[PDB]
């Protein structure tokens, strides 16, 4: 998982490889660097 104490806001962000996160806090939680703000297509395969 790699779950952390994060606010419950939905503000998707894009990361490494192609996975998008619910919000930035969740991203930094895992490790994945915020490549850009918003979800992401062929930068993930779901």
């Amino acid at each position: 998982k790699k779950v952390c104490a994060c606010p419950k806001i939905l503000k998707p962000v894009c990361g490494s490889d192609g996975r998008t996160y619910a919000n930035s806090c969740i991203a930094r939680c895992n490790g994945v660097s915020i490549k850009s703000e918003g979800s992401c297509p062929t930068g993930i395969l779901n």
Partner: protein, 223 residues
């Protein structure tokens, strides 16, 4: 909302959706022109959507009103999420009828064990992801202060209350931020944060509304 059920149409008439392109947080209508939400949901441009049930389909009961005033609690701490409350004044009053109504502020704080109703359009999964079209509802009890503090050592302030289950399974989640927690017809909490969603021994943490009744009142009267 993880482990909830689809709310009955207009069973939660005070629920609003904060939109800035897409739904990002929930909120509550406290009077015809004021909305209460979480301070971390703060954005300089916000469109409030009222009378929503299915957020992906125009059903004919909706009111889309832009926010005029957006005021975060003076002591909001972005790092600890203490004083996570925000007031939005609509640019035009909302029209009250069957699908749009106001929720009442609490006279005092809820006692532990009190059953409340939580709602929102947030994630319905704790491991994967699934966002619903329809508003989700969940009944959960306000937990004791000792239980809340043992669940989140050194992280609970006097402006936070835990609501949910220590057994996990049911909880609010991402996309529910700022939404209402109503007990006995009174707004007692605002969806704030937690360790993931629906995790064992990690119930959701909510802004304790009863501590802000005076601030809310002073702000509305002065604006």
């Amino acid at each position: 909302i993880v482990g909830g059920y689809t709310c009955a149409a207009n069973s939660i008439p005070y629920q609003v959706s904060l939109n800035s392109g897409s739904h990002f947080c929930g909120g509550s209508l406290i009077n015809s022109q004021w909305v209460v939400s979480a301070a971390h949901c703060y954005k300089s441009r916000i469109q409030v959507r009222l009378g929503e049930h299915n957020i992906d389909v125009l059903e004919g009961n909706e009111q889309f009103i832009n926010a005029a005033k957006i005021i975060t609690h003076p002591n909001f701490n972005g790092n600890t999420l203490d004083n996570d409350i925000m007031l939005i004044k609509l640019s035009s009053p909302a029209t009250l009828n069957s699908r749009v109504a106001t929720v009442s502020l609490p006279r005092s704080c809820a006692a532990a064990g009190t059953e409340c109703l939580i709602s929102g359009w947030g994630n319905t999964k704790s491991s994967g992801s699934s966002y619903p079209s329809l508003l989700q509802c969940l009944k959960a009890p306000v937990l004791s202060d000792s239980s809340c503090k043992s669940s989140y050592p050194g992280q609970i302030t006097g402006n936070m209350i835990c609501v949910g289950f220590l057994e996990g399974g049911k909880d609010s989640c991402q996309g529910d931020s700022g939404g209402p927690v109503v007990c006995n017809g009174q707004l007692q909490g605002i969806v704030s944060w937690g360790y993931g969603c629906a995790q064992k021994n990690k119930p959701g943490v909510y802004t304790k509304v009863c501590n802000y009744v005076n601030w809310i009142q002073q702000t509305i009267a002065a604006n």
